[PDB]
Amino acid sequence: MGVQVETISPGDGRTFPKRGQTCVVHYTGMLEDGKKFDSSRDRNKPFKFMLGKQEVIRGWEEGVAQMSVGQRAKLTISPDYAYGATGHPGIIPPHATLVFDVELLKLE
């Protein structure tokens, strides 16, 4: 499948990221079984990426673009939008569906 976006808390409902803007997010990344493999919250530093530059997985590029500033959402991402058949050795297994808890803090 693609990316599914399920709201956890609403944002402003008006400000959506455009290509080339820097998204500032806090995120927690989990496997489908619930195992956490990455989290900006445990590092206490938000993660920044520029939308449209393929600095993140495809599911993030398409999922975060559907979020408004201040929204917290659950993104469910199929492997084709993720680390695919290869996965990531020792971190993400092959053909893994990933779940991300993502809060869009601001755009730069």
Tab-separated table of N, CA and C in Angstrom:
chain	number	residue	atom	x	y	z
A	1	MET	N	0.831	-1.199	0.000
A	1	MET	CA	0.000	0.000	0.000
A	1	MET	C	0.869	1.254	0.000
A	2	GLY	N	0.273	2.403	0.304
A	2	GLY	CA	1.016	3.648	0.277
A	2	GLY	C	1.415	4.149	1.649
A	3	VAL	N	0.932	5.336	2.005
A	3	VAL	CA	1.044	5.868	3.355
A	3	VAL	C	-0.356	6.222	3.835
A	4	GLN	N	-0.684	5.793	5.047
A	4	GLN	CA	-1.935	6.145	5.701
A	4	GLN	C	-1.633	7.140	6.808
A	5	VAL	N	-2.412	8.215	6.871
A	5	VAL	CA	-2.231	9.262	7.871
A	5	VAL	C	-3.447	9.256	8.787
A	6	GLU	N	-3.217	8.992	10.071
A	6	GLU	CA	-4.264	8.985	11.082
A	6	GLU	C	-3.941	10.045	12.126
A	7	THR	N	-4.882	10.958	12.353
A	7	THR	CA	-4.623	12.086	13.237
A	7	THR	C	-4.580	11.640	14.690
A	8	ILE	N	-3.640	12.201	15.439
A	8	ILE	CA	-3.571	12.029	16.882
A	8	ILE	C	-4.026	13.289	17.609
A	9	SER	N	-3.533	14.453	17.179
A	9	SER	CA	-4.024	15.750	17.629
A	9	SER	C	-3.998	16.685	16.428
A	10	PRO	N	-4.978	17.574	16.302
A	10	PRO	CA	-5.016	18.452	15.127
A	10	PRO	C	-3.958	19.541	15.191
A	11	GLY	N	-3.529	19.970	14.009
A	11	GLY	CA	-2.734	21.170	13.855
A	11	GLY	C	-3.618	22.371	13.598
A	12	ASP	N	-3.044	23.382	12.945
A	12	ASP	CA	-3.845	24.566	12.649
A	12	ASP	C	-4.830	24.339	11.512
A	13	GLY	N	-4.715	23.221	10.796
A	13	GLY	CA	-5.603	22.906	9.697
A	13	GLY	C	-5.492	23.817	8.497
A	14	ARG	N	-4.455	24.655	8.424
A	14	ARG	CA	-4.356	25.606	7.323
A	14	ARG	C	-2.972	25.636	6.673
A	15	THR	N	-1.921	25.367	7.443
A	15	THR	CA	-0.545	25.525	6.972
A	15	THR	C	0.039	24.155	6.634
A	16	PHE	N	0.129	23.854	5.340
A	16	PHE	CA	0.689	22.583	4.904
A	16	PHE	C	2.057	22.789	4.268
A	17	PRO	N	2.988	21.851	4.456
A	17	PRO	CA	4.312	21.995	3.843
A	17	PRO	C	4.229	22.020	2.322
A	18	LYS	N	5.052	22.870	1.724
A	18	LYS	CA	5.236	22.910	0.286
A	18	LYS	C	6.646	22.442	-0.045
A	19	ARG	N	6.824	21.971	-1.280
A	19	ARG	CA	8.125	21.465	-1.703
A	19	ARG	C	9.197	22.524	-1.491
A	20	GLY	N	10.322	22.112	-0.901
A	20	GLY	CA	11.431	23.008	-0.650
A	20	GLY	C	11.425	23.685	0.703
A	21	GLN	N	10.347	23.551	1.471
A	21	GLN	CA	10.344	24.028	2.843
A	21	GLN	C	11.021	23.016	3.758
A	22	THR	N	11.601	23.515	4.845
A	22	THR	CA	12.197	22.643	5.849
A	22	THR	C	11.151	22.316	6.905
A	23	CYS	N	10.844	21.031	7.045
A	23	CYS	CA	9.927	20.558	8.071
A	23	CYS	C	10.719	20.236	9.328
A	24	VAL	N	10.263	20.752	10.464
A	24	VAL	CA	10.851	20.447	11.763
A	24	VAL	C	9.873	19.543	12.500
A	25	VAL	N	10.307	18.318	12.810
A	25	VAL	CA	9.433	17.288	13.362
A	25	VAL	C	10.078	16.633	14.575
A	26	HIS	N	9.228	16.160	15.483
A	26	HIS	CA	9.594	15.115	16.423
A	26	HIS	C	8.937	13.827	15.961
A	27	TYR	N	9.665	12.724	16.056
A	27	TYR	CA	9.135	11.477	15.533
A	27	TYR	C	9.572	10.313	16.399
A	28	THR	N	8.747	9.271	16.371
A	28	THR	CA	9.085	7.966	16.913
A	28	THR	C	8.779	6.948	15.829
A	29	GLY	N	9.764	6.120	15.497
A	29	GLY	CA	9.625	5.114	14.462
A	29	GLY	C	9.561	3.724	15.079
A	30	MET	N	8.540	2.970	14.678
A	30	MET	CA	8.305	1.630	15.189
A	30	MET	C	8.061	0.659	14.044
A	31	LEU	N	8.458	-0.591	14.262
A	31	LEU	CA	8.032	-1.659	13.377
A	31	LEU	C	6.545	-1.926	13.588
A	32	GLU	N	5.970	-2.741	12.704
A	32	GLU	CA	4.550	-3.045	12.834
A	32	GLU	C	4.251	-3.788	14.135
A	33	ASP	N	5.196	-4.590	14.637
A	33	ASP	CA	4.970	-5.274	15.909
A	33	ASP	C	4.972	-4.319	17.099
A	34	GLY	N	5.375	-3.062	16.898
A	34	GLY	CA	5.453	-2.083	17.961
A	34	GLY	C	6.854	-1.785	18.464
A	35	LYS	N	7.868	-2.513	17.993
A	35	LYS	CA	9.234	-2.287	18.452
A	35	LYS	C	9.765	-0.948	17.947
A	36	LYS	N	10.201	-0.099	18.877
A	36	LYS	CA	10.799	1.176	18.508
A	36	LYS	C	12.200	0.956	17.958
A	37	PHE	N	12.501	1.572	16.815
A	37	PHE	CA	13.855	1.522	16.283
A	37	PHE	C	14.525	2.885	16.171
A	38	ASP	N	13.781	3.987	16.275
A	38	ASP	CA	14.357	5.321	16.159
A	38	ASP	C	13.375	6.322	16.749
A	39	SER	N	13.911	7.363	17.387
A	39	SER	CA	13.055	8.394	17.976
A	39	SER	C	13.864	9.661	18.202
A	40	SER	N	13.407	10.775	17.629
A	40	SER	CA	14.031	12.056	17.938
A	40	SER	C	13.753	12.470	19.376
A	41	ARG	N	12.629	12.020	19.939
A	41	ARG	CA	12.257	12.400	21.298
A	41	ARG	C	13.244	11.865	22.326
A	42	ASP	N	13.793	10.671	22.097
A	42	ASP	CA	14.811	10.155	23.005
A	42	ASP	C	16.118	10.932	22.900
A	43	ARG	N	16.390	11.565	21.761
A	43	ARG	CA	17.565	12.418	21.632
A	43	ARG	C	17.312	13.856	22.062
A	44	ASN	N	16.051	14.229	22.300
A	44	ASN	CA	15.671	15.593	22.678
A	44	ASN	C	16.135	16.617	21.648
A	45	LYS	N	16.135	16.226	20.387
A	45	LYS	CA	16.469	17.161	19.325
A	45	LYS	C	15.521	16.905	18.166
A	46	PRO	N	14.745	17.902	17.746
A	46	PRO	CA	13.870	17.704	16.590
A	46	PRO	C	14.690	17.400	15.349
A	47	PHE	N	14.076	16.668	14.433
A	47	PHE	CA	14.691	16.310	13.166
A	47	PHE	C	14.176	17.243	12.078
A	48	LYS	N	15.086	17.731	11.233
A	48	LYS	CA	14.736	18.633	10.140
A	48	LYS	C	15.065	17.991	8.800
A	49	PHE	N	14.168	18.167	7.836
A	49	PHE	CA	14.434	17.755	6.466
A	49	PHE	C	13.749	18.739	5.541
A	50	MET	N	14.245	18.814	4.311
A	50	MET	CA	13.661	19.672	3.289
A	50	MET	C	12.754	18.822	2.407
A	51	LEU	N	11.470	19.177	2.369
A	51	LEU	CA	10.508	18.431	1.570
A	51	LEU	C	10.868	18.507	0.090
A	52	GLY	N	10.793	17.362	-0.591
A	52	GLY	CA	11.077	17.282	-2.011
A	52	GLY	C	12.515	16.986	-2.391
A	53	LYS	N	13.412	16.810	-1.421
A	53	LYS	CA	14.814	16.524	-1.700
A	53	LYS	C	15.186	15.068	-1.442
A	54	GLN	N	14.210	14.217	-1.111
A	54	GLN	CA	14.445	12.783	-0.904
A	54	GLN	C	15.518	12.537	0.156
A	55	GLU	N	15.491	13.356	1.209
A	55	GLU	CA	16.307	13.153	2.395
A	55	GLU	C	15.680	12.166	3.365
A	56	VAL	N	14.417	11.795	3.145
A	56	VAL	CA	13.677	10.874	3.996
A	56	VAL	C	12.975	9.864	3.097
A	57	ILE	N	12.382	8.841	3.720
A	57	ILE	CA	11.676	7.833	2.943
A	57	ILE	C	10.476	8.464	2.240
A	58	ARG	N	10.032	7.805	1.166
A	58	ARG	CA	8.944	8.348	0.358
A	58	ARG	C	7.680	8.543	1.187
A	59	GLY	N	7.370	7.587	2.065
A	59	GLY	CA	6.198	7.721	2.916
A	59	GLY	C	6.207	8.982	3.758
A	60	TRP	N	7.394	9.443	4.163
A	60	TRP	CA	7.482	10.709	4.884
A	60	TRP	C	7.216	11.892	3.964
A	61	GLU	N	7.801	11.876	2.764
A	61	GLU	CA	7.585	12.977	1.830
A	61	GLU	C	6.105	13.146	1.524
A	62	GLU	N	5.397	12.038	1.313
A	62	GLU	CA	3.981	12.132	0.988
A	62	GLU	C	3.120	12.291	2.237
A	63	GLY	N	3.513	11.656	3.342
A	63	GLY	CA	2.715	11.736	4.556
A	63	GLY	C	2.783	13.096	5.230
A	64	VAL	N	3.996	13.625	5.418
A	64	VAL	CA	4.140	14.905	6.107
A	64	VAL	C	3.524	16.038	5.288
A	65	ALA	N	3.560	15.933	3.958
A	65	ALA	CA	2.908	16.924	3.107
A	65	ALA	C	1.409	17.025	3.365
A	66	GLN	N	0.796	15.992	3.937
A	66	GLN	CA	-0.627	15.997	4.244
A	66	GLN	C	-0.925	16.511	5.644
A	67	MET	N	0.090	16.934	6.392
A	67	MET	CA	-0.090	17.373	7.767
A	67	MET	C	-0.030	18.889	7.856
A	68	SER	N	-0.758	19.438	8.816
A	68	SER	CA	-0.695	20.868	9.065
A	68	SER	C	0.223	21.144	10.250
A	69	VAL	N	0.734	22.373	10.307
A	69	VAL	CA	1.651	22.737	11.377
A	69	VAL	C	0.959	22.568	12.718
A	70	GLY	N	1.645	21.902	13.646
A	70	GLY	CA	1.105	21.604	14.953
A	70	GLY	C	0.381	20.280	15.052
A	71	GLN	N	0.185	19.582	13.939
A	71	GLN	CA	-0.507	18.305	13.970
A	71	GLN	C	0.433	17.204	14.430
A	72	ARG	N	-0.113	16.269	15.194
A	72	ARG	CA	0.554	15.018	15.507
A	72	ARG	C	-0.234	13.912	14.822
A	73	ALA	N	0.457	13.057	14.073
A	73	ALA	CA	-0.223	12.044	13.282
A	73	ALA	C	0.528	10.722	13.349
A	74	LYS	N	-0.212	9.645	13.123
A	74	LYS	CA	0.353	8.313	12.977
A	74	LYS	C	0.407	7.985	11.487
A	75	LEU	N	1.616	7.772	10.968
A	75	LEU	CA	1.820	7.385	9.577
A	75	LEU	C	2.105	5.893	9.528
A	76	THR	N	1.311	5.157	8.760
A	76	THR	CA	1.571	3.746	8.498
A	76	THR	C	2.067	3.627	7.066
A	77	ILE	N	3.249	3.047	6.894
A	77	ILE	CA	3.979	3.124	5.636
A	77	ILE	C	4.334	1.715	5.188
A	78	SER	N	3.893	1.344	3.990
A	78	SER	CA	4.205	0.044	3.421
A	78	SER	C	5.648	0.020	2.914
A	79	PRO	N	6.246	-1.172	2.792
A	79	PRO	CA	7.691	-1.239	2.507
A	79	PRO	C	8.108	-0.560	1.213
A	80	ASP	N	7.255	-0.534	0.186
A	80	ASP	CA	7.640	0.145	-1.049
A	80	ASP	C	7.832	1.646	-0.851
A	81	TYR	N	7.233	2.224	0.190
A	81	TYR	CA	7.369	3.636	0.530
A	81	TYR	C	8.381	3.859	1.644
A	82	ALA	N	9.206	2.856	1.913
A	82	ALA	CA	9.958	2.660	3.141
A	82	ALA	C	11.270	2.029	2.706
A	83	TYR	N	11.816	1.116	3.501
A	83	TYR	CA	13.098	0.490	3.194
A	83	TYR	C	12.996	-0.766	2.320
A	84	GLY	N	11.828	-1.042	1.740
A	84	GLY	CA	11.617	-2.053	0.717
A	84	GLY	C	11.953	-3.493	1.108
A	85	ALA	N	12.291	-4.266	0.072
A	85	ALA	CA	12.670	-5.666	0.254
A	85	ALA	C	13.995	-5.798	0.984
A	86	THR	N	14.892	-4.838	0.779
A	86	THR	CA	16.210	-4.892	1.390
A	86	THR	C	16.150	-4.570	2.882
A	87	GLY	N	15.287	-3.631	3.270
A	87	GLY	CA	15.270	-3.195	4.650
A	87	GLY	C	16.549	-2.450	4.995
A	88	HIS	N	16.873	-2.454	6.282
A	88	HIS	CA	18.128	-1.884	6.770
A	88	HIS	C	18.796	-2.870	7.721
A	89	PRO	N	19.897	-3.517	7.295
A	89	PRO	CA	20.581	-4.534	8.112
A	89	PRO	C	20.693	-4.228	9.592
A	90	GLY	N	20.097	-5.092	10.405
A	90	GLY	CA	20.183	-4.970	11.845
A	90	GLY	C	19.268	-3.936	12.462
A	91	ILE	N	18.488	-3.206	11.663
A	91	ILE	CA	17.595	-2.191	12.215
A	91	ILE	C	16.169	-2.400	11.712
A	92	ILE	N	16.003	-2.515	10.398
A	92	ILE	CA	14.692	-2.678	9.790
A	92	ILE	C	14.713	-3.933	8.928
A	93	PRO	N	13.825	-4.888	9.169
A	93	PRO	CA	13.870	-6.156	8.437
A	93	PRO	C	13.315	-5.998	7.034
A	94	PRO	N	13.517	-6.997	6.177
A	94	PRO	CA	12.950	-6.943	4.828
A	94	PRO	C	11.434	-6.828	4.869
A	95	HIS	N	10.885	-6.107	3.886
A	95	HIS	CA	9.437	-6.046	3.655
A	95	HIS	C	8.683	-5.560	4.893
A	96	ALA	N	9.233	-4.565	5.582
A	96	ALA	CA	8.687	-4.135	6.863
A	96	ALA	C	7.727	-2.968	6.682
A	97	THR	N	6.509	-3.125	7.189
A	97	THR	CA	5.607	-1.991	7.343
A	97	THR	C	6.011	-1.201	8.579
A	98	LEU	N	6.146	0.113	8.426
A	98	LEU	CA	6.607	0.977	9.504
A	98	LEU	C	5.493	1.904	9.973
A	99	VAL	N	5.488	2.181	11.274
A	99	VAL	CA	4.544	3.095	11.898
A	99	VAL	C	5.338	4.235	12.517
A	100	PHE	N	4.974	5.468	12.175
A	100	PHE	CA	5.644	6.654	12.689
A	100	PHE	C	4.650	7.526	13.438
A	101	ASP	N	5.006	7.897	14.665
A	101	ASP	CA	4.318	8.946	15.410
A	101	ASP	C	5.063	10.245	15.125
A	102	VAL	N	4.411	11.179	14.433
A	102	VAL	CA	5.082	12.363	13.904
A	102	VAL	C	4.326	13.606	14.346
A	103	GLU	N	5.052	14.560	14.925
A	103	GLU	CA	4.506	15.863	15.284
A	103	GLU	C	5.217	16.920	14.453
A	104	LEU	N	4.455	17.681	13.669
A	104	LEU	CA	5.030	18.728	12.825
A	104	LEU	C	5.070	20.016	13.641
A	105	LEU	N	6.269	20.376	14.115
A	105	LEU	CA	6.435	21.503	15.031
A	105	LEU	C	6.433	22.846	14.308
A	106	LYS	N	7.103	22.940	13.163
A	106	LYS	CA	7.136	24.199	12.428
A	106	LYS	C	7.774	23.965	11.068
A	107	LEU	N	7.670	24.984	10.218
A	107	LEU	CA	8.266	24.992	8.891
A	107	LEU	C	9.251	26.145	8.793
A	108	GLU	N	10.358	25.914	8.102
A	108	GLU	CA	11.385	26.941	7.973
A	108	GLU	C	11.692	27.243	6.514
